[PDB]
Amino acid sequence: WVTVYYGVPVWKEATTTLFCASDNVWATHCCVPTDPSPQEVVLENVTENFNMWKNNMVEQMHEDIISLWDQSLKPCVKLTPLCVTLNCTDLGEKGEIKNCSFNITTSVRDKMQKEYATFYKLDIVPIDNDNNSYRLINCNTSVITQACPKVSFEPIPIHYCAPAGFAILKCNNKTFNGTGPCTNVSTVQCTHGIRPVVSTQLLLNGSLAEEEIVIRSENFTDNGKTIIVQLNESVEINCTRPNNNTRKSIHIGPGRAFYTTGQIIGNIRQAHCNISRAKWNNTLHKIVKKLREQFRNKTIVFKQSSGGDPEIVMHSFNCGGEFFYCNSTQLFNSTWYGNESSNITLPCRIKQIINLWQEVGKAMYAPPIGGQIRCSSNITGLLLTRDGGNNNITTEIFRPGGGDMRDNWRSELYKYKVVKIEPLGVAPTKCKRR
Amino acid sequence: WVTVYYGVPVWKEATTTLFCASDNVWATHCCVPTDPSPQEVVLENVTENFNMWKNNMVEQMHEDIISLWDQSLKPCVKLTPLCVTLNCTDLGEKGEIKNCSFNITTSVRDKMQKEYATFYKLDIVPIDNDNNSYRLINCNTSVITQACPKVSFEPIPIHYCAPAGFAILKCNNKTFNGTGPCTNVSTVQCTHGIRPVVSTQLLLNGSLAEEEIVIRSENFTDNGKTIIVQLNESVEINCTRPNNNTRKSIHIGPGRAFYTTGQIIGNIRQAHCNISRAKWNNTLHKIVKKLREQFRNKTIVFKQSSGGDPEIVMHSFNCGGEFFYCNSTQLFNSTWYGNESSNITLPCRIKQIINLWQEVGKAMYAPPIGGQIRCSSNITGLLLTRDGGNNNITTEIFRPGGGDMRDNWRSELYKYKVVKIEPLGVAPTKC
Amino acid sequence: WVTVYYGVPVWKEATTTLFCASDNVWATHCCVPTDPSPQEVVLENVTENFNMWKNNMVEQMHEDIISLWDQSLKPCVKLTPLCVTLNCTDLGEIKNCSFNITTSVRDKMQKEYATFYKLDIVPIDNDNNSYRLINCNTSVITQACPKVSFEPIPIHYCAPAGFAILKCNNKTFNGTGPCTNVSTVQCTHGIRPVVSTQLLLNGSLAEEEIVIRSENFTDNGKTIIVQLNESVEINCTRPNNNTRKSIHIGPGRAFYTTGQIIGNIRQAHCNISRAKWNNTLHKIVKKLREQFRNKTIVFKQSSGGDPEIVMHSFNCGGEFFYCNSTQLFNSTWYGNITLPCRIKQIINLWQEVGKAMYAPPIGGQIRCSSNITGLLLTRDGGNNNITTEIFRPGGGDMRDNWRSELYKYKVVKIEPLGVAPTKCKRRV
Amino acid sequence: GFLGAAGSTMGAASMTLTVQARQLLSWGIKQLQARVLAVEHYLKDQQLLGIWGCSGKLICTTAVPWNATWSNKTLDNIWNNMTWMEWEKEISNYTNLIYNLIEESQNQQEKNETENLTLC
Amino acid sequence: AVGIGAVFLGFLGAAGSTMGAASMTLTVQARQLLSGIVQQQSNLLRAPECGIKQLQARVLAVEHYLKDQQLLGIWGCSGKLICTTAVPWNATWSNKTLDNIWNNMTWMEWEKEISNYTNLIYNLIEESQNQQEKNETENLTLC
Amino acid sequence: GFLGAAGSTMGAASMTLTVQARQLLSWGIKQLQARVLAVEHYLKDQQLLGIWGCSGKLICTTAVPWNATWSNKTLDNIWNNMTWMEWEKEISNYTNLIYNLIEESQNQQEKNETENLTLC
Amino acid sequence: XXXXXXXXXXXXXXXXXXXXXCXXXXXXXXXXXXXXXXXXXXXXXXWXXXXXXXXXXXXXXXXXXXXXXXXXXXXXXXXXXXXXXXXXXXXXXXXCXXXXXXXXXXXXXXXXXXXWXXXXXXXX
Amino acid sequence: XXXXXXXXXXXXXXXXXXXXXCXXXXXXXXXXXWXXXXXXXXXXXXXXXXXXXXXXXXXXXXXXXXXXXXXXXXXXXXXXXXXXXXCXXXXXXXXXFXXXXXXXX
Ligand SMILES: *[C@@H]1O[C@H](CO)[C@@H](O[C@@H]2O[C@H](CO)[C@@H](O[C@@H]3O[C@H](CO)[C@@H](O)[C@H](O)[C@@H]3O)[C@H](O)[C@H]2NC(C)=O)[C@H](O)[C@H]1NC(C)=O
Ligand SMILES: *[C@@H]1O[C@H](CO)[C@@H](O[C@@H]2O[C@H](CO)[C@@H](O)[C@H](O)[C@H]2NC(C)=O)[C@H](O)[C@H]1NC(C)=O
Ligand SMILES: *[C@@H]1O[C@H](CO)[C@@H](O)[C@H](O)[C@H]1NC(C)=O
Ligand SMILES: *[C@@H]1O[C@H](CO)[C@@H](O)[C@H](O)[C@H]1NC(C)=O
Ligand SMILES: *[C@@H]1O[C@H](CO)[C@@H](O)[C@H](O)[C@H]1NC(C)=O
Ligand SMILES: *[C@@H]1O[C@H](CO)[C@@H](O)[C@H](O)[C@H]1NC(C)=O
Ligand SMILES: *[C@@H]1O[C@H](CO)[C@@H](O)[C@H](O)[C@H]1NC(C)=O
Secondary structure, eight states: OEEEEOOOEEEEOOOOOEEEEEOHHHHHOOOOOOOOOOOEEEETTTEEEEEETSSSHHHHHHHHHHHHHHHTTTSBBGGGGGGGOOEEOOOOOOOEEEEEEEEEEEETTHHHHHEEEEEEGGGEOSSSSSSSEEETTTTTTTTEEETTTTTTOOOOOOOEEOOEEEEEEEEETOOOOSEEEEEEEEESSBBOOOOOOBBSSSSSSSOOOSSOOEESSSSSTTTTSOOEEEEEEEEEEEHHHEEEEEEEEEEETEEEEEEEEEEEEEEEOOOOEEEEEEHHHHHHHHHHHHTTTTTOOOOOEOOOOOOOOOHHHHEEEETTTTEEEEGGGGGGGGEEEEEOOOOOEEEEEEOSSEEEEEEEEEEEEEOOOOEEEEEEEEEEEEEEEOOOOOOOEEEEEEEEEOOSTTTHHHHTTTEEEEEEEEEEEOOOOOOOOO | EEEESSSOOOOEEEEOOEEEOOHHHHHSOOOEESSSSSOEEEEEEOOOOETTSSSSHHHHHHHHHHHHHHHTTTTTOOOOOOOOOEEOOOOOOOTEEEEEEEEEOOOOOEEEEEEEEEEEGGGEEOOSSTTTEEEETTTSSSEEOOOOOOOOOOOOOOOEEETTEEEEEEEEETTTEEEEESSSSEEEOOOOOEEEEEEBBBBEOOOOOOOSEEOOOSSSSSSSSEEEEEEEEEEEEEEEEEEEEEEEEEEEEEEEEEEEEEESSSOOOOEEEEOOHHHHHHHHHHHHHHHHHTTTOOEEEOOOSSSSSSSHHSEEEEEETEEEEEOGGTSOOOEEOOTTTOOOEEEEEEEEEOTOOOOSEEEEOOOOOOOEEEEEEEEEEEEEEESOOOOOOSSSEEOOOOSTHHHHHHHHHHEEEEEEEEOOEEEOOOO | OOOEEESOEEEOHHHHHEEEEOOOOOOTTTTBBSSSSOOOEETTTTTEEEGGGGHHHHHHHHHHHHHHHHTTTTSSBBOHHHHOOEEEEEEEOEEEEEEEEEEEEEOOOEEEEEEEGGGGGOOOOOSSSSEHHHHHHHHTEEEETTSSOOOOBBEEEEOTTTEEEEEEEOOOSSEEEEEESSSEEEEOOOOHHHHHHSBBBBBBOOOOSSSEEEEOOSSEEEEEEEEEEEEEEEEEEEEEEEEEEEEETTTTTTEEEEEESSSOOOOEEEEEEEHHHHHHHHHHHHHTTTTTTEEEEOOOSSSSTTTTSSSEEEEESOOEEOGGGGTTTTOOEOOOOOEEEEESSSSSSTOSSSSEEEOOOOOOEEEEEEEEEEEEEEEEETTTSSSEEEEEEEOSTTTHHHHHTTTTTEEEEEEEEEEEEEEHHHHO | TTHHHHHGGOEEEEEEEEEEEEEOOOOOOHHHHHHHHHHHHHHHHHHHHHHOOOOOOOOOOOOOOSSSSOOOOOOOHHHHSSOHHHHHHTTGHHHHHHHHHHHHHHHHHHHHIIIIOOOO | OOSSSGGGTTTTTEEEEEBHHGGHHHOOOOOOOOTTTHHHHHTTTTTOOOHHHHHHHHHHHHHHHHHHHHHHTTTTTTOOOOEEOOOOOOOOTTOOOHHHHSSBHHHHHHHHTTGHHHHHHHHHHHHHHHHHHHHHHHSGOOO | TTTTTTTHHHHHHHHHHHHHHHHHTTHHHHHHHHHHHHHHHHHHHHHHHTTTTTTTEEEOOSOOOOOOOOOOOOOOHHHTTBHHHHHHTTTTTOOOSHHHHHHHHHHHHHTTTTTTOOOO | OOOEEEEOOOOOOEEEEEEEEEOOHHHHHOHHHHHEEEEEEEEEEEEEEEEEEEEEEEEOOOGGGGEEEEEEEETEEEEEEEEEEEEEGGGGGEEEEEEOOOTTTEEOOOOEEEOOOOOOOEEE | OOOEOOOOOOOOSSOOOOOEEEEEESSGGGEEEEEEETTTSOOOEEEEEETTEOTTTTTTTTEOTTTEEEEEEEOOOSSOOOOEEEEESSSTTTTTEEOOEEEEE
């Protein structure tokens, strides 16, 4: 009369805790081995509504990244004893790197030892007006923790996996705009491999579009929303720190060693980064061609972002353990009209005291790496912001940079949603109970 | 023939972990919502033995309270750089509040900064023979942790609830003396709302007796036991901290600030509590009548607790966010006979360094609250201790204050016991 | 016809997490009550393959002991204010060291005195008076809490439901291979987590004679575990009537040291019964010759006076003894004893990097009443052609102090679901 | 495959009830709660199936009439022209009413099984 | 209003009633216990914002449910509130008139009366089911 | 005794299935994981028995004649002259695929109960 | 003997919730069913609701089941009743009463009003 | 079920053996209770169950029969009979009351 069916293939939207599979900090945290050849069950006749900007998988990824970084830094050397006056001189540009001396108590707590350390200008703030007395940029208002040299934060592919009772639905529409119905949807246990790459303007080592550049925005006419551009072909970006550094340790406690550059061999050089000019020009041409679909009959103008701290206006990234802040102005300085047809060297600065999550009263010190650093990354997407208050004219201005760190992960999680399985269904059959 | 019955209305005494529900430390911990119109079932013809002095719900409440107090102080500022010599001058009786200066190293390790802070006399102990040289009390033998200004410890009603498979039995005898059989028993899943109020002599904001004053003791003959007096009517106690304080923040580290009082506006005035004289006089008369029933044909004399330690000879409480230590001598200084017929302002001291749970090597610093503090609490019970050795006289001596902290909560949990449900059983049948 | 059976008494060898029961660091950890006398089912007509050398119960015991020790020392005093120059005067095995230490009050420094052993004092200058606390240069020395006992007590390792512990009851079992007398228990016996390096004190005795087990007996570099059926009584005496005092270095955090030694200062010695030890070595060589036939057995030691490599290290309840093994293993066998020992207060039992523990002294005088129940010996390689077999004390690591007791146990996973043929139809 | 029948008709999906039923059963506290929660969800459904006289069955026919205020499409379309997702959405507002009647029906059956037929 | 079985007394309401009358409220007790997880999940949905103590309480509640269900599953009692077996009652377990047991005793008094024999009785019940299980396949006329 | 029949023949050992069944269910993360794992194994086996038409049984004959291979011994050689440990070794292979046959057979039978087998 | 007495709001608005209360006296609340019924002007009494006091085992007339509630406070020994969106047509003299619970050793039961309170006139 | 007053009125000048019946749509078994709904008062119980005299009931108040044909009568309605003869089916059919007969005398 009324028949109960258990094992009904239905689900409802739900938020749960996801676990993480891999295959240092990521390998340790995402300790679950992955399953080769995931079942990837195709749903032959379903339509599922997605919304990449309300996806709680991004919120969980963000919280997991912050928690993992915090746990990784807890069992490490604190730099509180170094919040002292620094007597700094210049090396060699012409003042970018300083050789600073100070009086610090050593591991045996009865001897004051004069020590020398090498600091970058961005990490040093003047104290006095003599141009010699400096202090660490925020040591009086925050606790600076040295990253453990044995703990690697290098991004690796990770997979977010649903617990039993839940499933992840993946949109397999190659041109899906991140919101609305997807009519070609499959069910997976885990997401694809996602690299937790931290950057502020360009998306590095991400996924490429299958057929075309896809430009996504929560509301394209709302100037306050970040535009995420997913490229269909990567652009190679080759960043380097050519200075050959010899590292030394300064001991500041019973087993608490401060790491600094001991000496620089050869000449001091700028940590430039090279992007191919032809590939970037074609990339911008194709971005303009797709962007003009949302902004009809407008000139597309690329400009650098409004002035501010390097974390806001420069391209920030982790290259081999060093944090580079590159001047991207040469990449976003052009006017395109739509009637066109078809090396860039970016200077960069190195900053050792990093506050990646904008925490109050906390900062990380990245110890120097000796030798030279070279990275080759793939630019797979862009974060653009459209100027506000810009109307009544025939041109649009786009600037690099998005919102917070979530924008770097939505670009990978845009095709996934987590659903809860509801196996109990009821149908009005006519069978009697007995 | 053996017949198996499942759903048998049988239970056994058991100890389990109860969860906390509520309708701030307590709002955060007791996150589970309560049920509307909670289910209570009266058990007819059921006699159940209760013993309020062997009730594991009290032990759990005690451990949970201590655990939350310990957890809430974990991320807060530890006041270790302040255990230094203080140059303290009188601020005003004039010496109750002192203006103390000290040389403290600030967040910059090579720069010494002279700072000023305001401390109460009870928190400052002289160290040298210089009348102006003092140090913080117990800072050399304990770690003083500042309470976080954003964390409120104000007690709210909470309910202790049994997990499924267990039930809480309640005694509905309005004059039950806390031990022995109870013949009016009901089963509930959650206790009534209990406020985790901390005090040393008077029980504040508690439950009132349904019918008359009920006096309970594990053994009345044994004078070493605490006597818990549950009142018929509450007595209102209105406590004031009249000083208008301005909070000041002293930075003692890289993101660690110490909070003190920078200035006081107006005159320095004594904190005090106002208890109605007629209501207290009636309360003591009624208590004496019940004590005479327990202690037949004897004179009942109330005296203040002996000793000089403000923690045990004064009425202390946390109200308004500050800890008051009030001199209750005016309340417990009387002689009553059997032929008796049918404002009191208590001076109070403020103490900022509180060893609230009698910990070894630990203390909390209560930061000052600016403005003035007003408090209105209900006195719903008393803890009395009887003097021993008076076996050759006709007068009994009672003093305020009990022998334990748990006694403040037994007075609320005395009517509840936790039992485990045993739904399965067997019996012979006519098969 | 296929019939499914549930509750089948079969199992596979498996590694799972074991929990712990006990009747102190082990107290409040091994929180489960023990069996009301052993609950054991003897399994008749069964054979079970055992392997004491690949038994993950030993590895779990190792990890559990390290974790317990690491947790036990966290809420204790960290001796970082003491890594200062010491002015030490000989009493020169034990020195009276004075130092200027800042106390709990940040504005005041006191000149304190403490008693340190030579093994815990590092010379730092050429004046023969300036010394520093050992390893404080690079490690954090944590004082053991004086209220927490590290005495080894019997504990029982228990399997979770769905798993069972099988025990081999073959009194002469070689440690590996098929066992023909097997029983089922839920918990192991009262194993003593004794920390030692050669002597295996306060262990279990062999049921019969002396049983000598090894993973191979022909490979070089492997431990030989000798289990005795008779105990050898040892009374290790530290006849120094110490009076202990505390030094307050932080806000209720104090360092505990010996304040004075009353009477004479004498080297600690282990009084080992001569007849029992001589008979023990005699019986050991008599059984050892069954495995190393037609050979002379001698004891020729390893290397010199390295407390953590060559000397016999063992605990007594806070006073760690480092004994000179050459007193006991120097004989030639064919056809009282007073063992000198040193005391070391700064130890690193599991060779951790950046950490060390300070063991507070025990006041009064002490006697370490203990039994030799077995030995960990290593054979000297390359002597197969000289007619004399050379053995030495030591070798291996801490795992061999537990393998000698857990050799008779294995953990198995129960597989209650079986399939078997029947005569019945489903009758759908 | 798991949920492979999700886009199929209600009739066809009845042959995949065992595919989902097995899949549903399978740092630190963060993940330990998930395992406990998964068990509770499994048991939640089993308890509901235990309350209803549906224990041990994938398809359980009840004794509750369907002639109420419930939205009920012709069976030809429910089983051959509808999937379970749209079906469950169609009757979503009546889910609790349906469940309550099923429990009530079982309680009457229990009275017959436990209170009336007092045989042995 | 008129009927048999004091369901309206609520959970444990019949605890003070005699064994016979209280047998009409087994459903009341069972519903309170056999819905503990369903009800707990419903209570959890009222405050989604809601470590060791909570997991121990939840695991214990699950273990108690599963142990009762396993024990009834081992006995031939699955799905039944009242279950009878093939085990005769021993005169040593309790020597009383059956009418007085059912009409002059409550279940509390009864369970106290036979407490020392409860585990013994349970073991006998299990033994009888094993014999029945063999009878289901040993007697091939049922197959 | 618990597992005392392991060295006994399969026939005799079939009488202690409840002895083992009772014993299959019977830094705080370590103890909780041990308890959760024991619960998960119990439920895993109970679900497998209940997806098959074996719920509530200790001995369950299913709708499966023996297929090619699967067993190399007859009824007397297995039940009277062999132990369960020896049996597990004898059929250490052929431990899968049959489970899907049984699962599908049970689902087909439950569907048939509402379509054409001993119907309604 | 039982001396129940009713009290109620002086007046209610039309199409608004209404409530009333009844105090028990000289009787156990438990082992009896608290009840309320009301008589419209120039009409026979109609039963409205009842609840077993021992466990709040409420029951109500089907006509009012969708817009009625009943509760009691054992601590106060008092019953209460309410109805949602009370219509003007609901005006009546509403009385509370105790219906004895005629429990037998056989677990039989019956209930009917026995002890009546004076009515509380009410209108919406 | 439902209850109804079969007699619209049961009035007499004095001392009549007045009677009324309580009819029903279905049997009320032993629950056909009676009450005296006196003017300006809550109704008094007249008889419990089908014929169990109410506590302190008058000796002259008779009750008889049951269920769908229950009845009650005065031995003699000597005084104060002007009360409606209410009855109820206090059984499965909730606690439905009859219209009540307009008794008088
Ligand atoms: C709790 O205990 C009381 C007292 O034992 C129980 O009440 C008693 O119930 C019996 C029925 O089992 C009553 O007997 C009946 O009395 C009437 C009186 O007119 C008589 O006509 C019947 O034939 C029968 O004898 C007894 O009077 C009654 N006693 C009292 C004092 O009320 C009560 O039922 C028990 N409660 C539970 C929940 O078991
Ligand atoms: C959506 O349609 C595409 C084809 O346009 C399907 O793509 C195939 O997906 C399978 C997945 O196993 C691959 O093996 C094939 O190689 C893909 N084919 C091509 C031509 O690329 C896709 O699976 C469909 N997805 C859904 C959910 O219906
Ligand atoms: C996509 O990639 C192909 C690669 O050949 C390229 O030709 C095409 O222009 C790209 N599309 C866009 C929109 O950039
Ligand atoms: C970056 O390096 C790769 C080889 O690692 C090379 O293919 C690519 O052309 C380089 N990019 C630029 C912009 O020079
Ligand atoms: C310091 O400690 C001693 C005991 O060692 C105590 O007597 C003294 O009062 C303490 N000082 C302060 C300021 O509390
Ligand atoms: C305390 O304050 C309350 C506030 O309402 C007032 O009623 C009471 O009389 C006051 N009592 C005293 C003793 O001041
Ligand atoms: C999807 O729909 C088509 C008809 O449009 C049908 O043939 C096919 O079987 C459906 N898919 C599934 C998985 O049943």
